[PDB]
Amino acid sequence: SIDSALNWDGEMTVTRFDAMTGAHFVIRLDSTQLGPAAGGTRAAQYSNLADALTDAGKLAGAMTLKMAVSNLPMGGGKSVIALPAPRHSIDPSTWARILRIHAENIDKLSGNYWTGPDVNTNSADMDTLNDTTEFVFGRSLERGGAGSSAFTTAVGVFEAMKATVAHRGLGSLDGLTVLVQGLGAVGGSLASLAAEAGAQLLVADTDTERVAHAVALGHTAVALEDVLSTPCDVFAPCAMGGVITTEVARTLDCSVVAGAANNVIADEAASDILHARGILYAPDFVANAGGAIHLVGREVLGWSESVVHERAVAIGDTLNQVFEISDNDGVTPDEAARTLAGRRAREAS
Template identity: 60%
Template sequence: MALPEWDGELTSVRYDRGTGAWFVIGVHSTRLGPASGGTRAMVYPSPGDAVADARRLAGAMTLKMAVAGLPMGGGKSVIALPAPRAELGEATWRRILEIHAANLELLGGNYTTGPDVGTCSADMDVLAGLTPHVFGRSVAAGGPGSSGPMTALGVFAAIRAGVAEAGFDGVDGLRVLVQGLGAVGADVARLAADAGAKLIVTDVDPARCAAVADELGAEVVGTGAVTTRECDVLVPCATGGLITAEVAETLPIAVVAGAANNLLADPYAAEVLRRRGIVHAPDFVANAGGAIHLVGREVLGWSADAVADRTRAIGDTLTGVFADARTHGTTTVTAAQDLAARTLTGEH
């Protein structure tokens, strides 16, 4: 496979004929400490797409750790499955986790992983029996449990900061569209509903939509309406690449803040959003609550309350990012990247 240049430190790629899975680990930076990032397991169009995703996500983790002030570097694992996980069977999945653990061991502690799309705390429990280089074990296994609630809390703090920057007096009465109703998206929806938002939801799983609509009185729209449905706040909590420059030109929104990694499909989309006056909370700032939860509890020994307070402070970080972007006439992505760069170089 042909791979483009990358500014990261290491890419590990392994194929296992027995399971048909490709294993990719991207270590982007160990400048602030050992690299860390979740394990994503899903079907990809090609091994090259899996490598590209791991590298993008690892770079975003470097920025996330730096902006959040955590003593860790950025990395990511991607397991490109031969079929959806539900179709693989328990024995095949167990073998995949064993191979993944062996790959982690080869890196000797320079990279530690946790749950991500397609994996969960129970999987981290299995990995922890095979390698010490794991975050995010279940509470029953002595870990801090799912990072989903803290990710959602941080995203909601980002929403609050975004609507304030856009000139709104709080979330009450605003139309908030949540895309993706997994563990994070569903919790964000609940927080928005509790704050008085007029909730709009969408998900590829109709059952999830129906459950959230019943629980919270949300309006359900089709997945194709995500970028065309008029609303005040768009909250992408599915996979990345939603907003291209072309999509950014017509988005009928005032604020975008969500949990999805690599939300922008191309860098120019951020400039289009800035030009149109749409407040954009960069994803690597908005979704840092999960990293704060795992690193704070398992590395730094913080209490649950300390983790929650640090996660809510994501809103303060974004308020500063928005101010810097306005002052210097840049996009919020550039302002947030500059903040991360200052941390990585010891200037912050």
């Protein structure tokens, strides 16, 4: 309900409703402790407004931890645009109006929130926001931004994956079966990187053309209905979050979970179940941080493309630290990553 969604502990919630387009807007700032809150804009259809608020809150909390654990001097926030219809069907006029409105909202926060792309938003959209507000990462190269962060995210997830498989004792990825759920911007790149390292890929996507392309490349399609029941060495969720529910955690047939999606774990019990079953999960907020490293590194810290690459690869080392903590203290990898995030943040202050 709205009441439960409003019982959230973050720093601020910004909302707006635009009767003309019928769109609802949410900006959640989980924390501004390390710096202004930063996070992308997701646009999707939600069943109830409450869902958009809850997703924004979980996404914003993930950004706070992602920044902290990755030694990025930013807080965490997220924007969710609850669409009046499927993205597909939204006309250009309506989408342009929605973006102008979102930009006005960001603008009022005057630098306390910096946006970027997320699901259903791109660099062209970031250039549009930027026509109205300064606080946007991810603009096109021509507009002064760093462009797509997808590739860097993939590199980071792939390095997360290699470090995870290694710590789990499976050796290298050559020969291992990897199931990639979601062949999007990040997923498609991750599939190619894993393939080049010798993995056998199993893939799934609601978009049939994407699947056909992967199959043309030698991969094996998996029916959507069987994704969570398919045996594999590594399950790589690269679509939406909330995939690993307590029920799915009890029956997942794999040894490692390492993907790009945000908020992979639907509930705490699910995290405790994977840990107890010996399935090594590389925490989402650590593993998928290459996108933030690329945007913040490039646009805020002035790092070179080379250095961003290096920091993304370093996600493997961060995870080795997380696993180290998990093994020594007897806690799940998610809890150990939160601990590490806290240590890093403190150090960074």
